[PDB]
Symmetry: C2
Subunit: 184 residues, 2 copies
């Protein structure tokens, strides 16, 4: 069958913790599951050098997209073909939020590039862990990314589930499980 | 205003040599020049990344593009803005030939990615060194790449100057010189 879920939000919003707990919930139900992340899941070396360099927003986006392209072909699609629940910590929405809304690249173009890079694969549900940057390129930048994420979620209410990331981690996990139950 | 020139073709066709000699010819007659290349002109580290085992053609192109986007913004446009003649050893057409005609990616997608990466910057002339594919991933790959280059040149016959890469390198350089002389009195 196959089921593709993603987690999104600012760095510091409990995405890794919630990915781990979601995988454990599915492991407890006997559902085979795969945990992965971006950047680095396709091309690990892209993660290393985005860490220690600052490029133009266009170059940054295209590197992320190259990693994304290998990630989809070598990790996500094969996992889904085996009937696994693939959970990716960050996917296309991160690039739209950080490089698009944050750094100012045009979103129609961003989505143009992603069409062939993702082979059109999009998640069935995306969990957005929303919070202000204080609760996790300056504060103004992170504010744009956050509002970008909220704007993206307003546009696709059938795909996005927006959770208050400031809540206790146990409540957030149970909320994710509640939203996910109907799809299993 | 500046002048933007490129050299293109299969590896082994003498492109580096011609780019080097072209630079000299211009320097000699007091035209300041910036000599550069892809892959590596924008992001040096991309050259390592491109050699990744079994890299998808999509990801390969996106790596070339990322390098190309940094190359155009940080090196090529600032050089042209300074009135230099910028010569690039490989540019967009390398990707179109190798990743498009060679690896099978759809050209319109490649061009649309490129539009924002290059800010629409095109070379005034591109010197295509046409080399036989056996003298350059088997032969059938390189056969497609060679013919793709020739297809690109047919579609933009004013931009591309197609030259026989098996000629002596002085005769190639002289032919490049003759095409440029109208562009710099
Ligand atoms: Mg992408
Ligand atoms: Mg948010
Ligand atoms: Mg490109
Ligand atoms: Mg060219």
């Amino acid at each position: 069958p196959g089921l593709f879920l993603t987690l999104e939000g600012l760095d510091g919003s409990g995405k890794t913790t919630q990915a781990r707990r979601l995988a454990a919930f599915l492991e407890a139900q006997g559902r085979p599951v795969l945990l992965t992340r971006e950047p680095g899941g396709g091309l690990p070396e892209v993660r290393s050098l985005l860490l220690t360099q600052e490029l133009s927003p266009e170059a940054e986006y295209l590197l992320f997209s190259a990693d994304r392209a290998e990630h989809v072909r070598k990790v996500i699609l094969p996992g889904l073909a085996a009937g696994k629940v693939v959970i990716s910590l960050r996917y296309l929405d991160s690039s739209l939020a950080y490089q698009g809304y944050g750094r100012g690249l045009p979103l129609p173009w961003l989505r143009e590039v992603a069409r062939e890079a993702t082979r059109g694969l999009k998640p069935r549900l995306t969990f957005l862990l929303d919070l202000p940057p204080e609760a996790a390129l300056g504060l103004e930048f992170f504010r744009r990314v956050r509002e970008g994420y909220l704007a993206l979620a307003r546009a696709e209410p059938g795909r996005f589930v927006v959770l208050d990331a400031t809540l206790p981690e146990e409540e957030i996990a149970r909320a994710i499980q509640a939203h996910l139950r109907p799809l299993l």
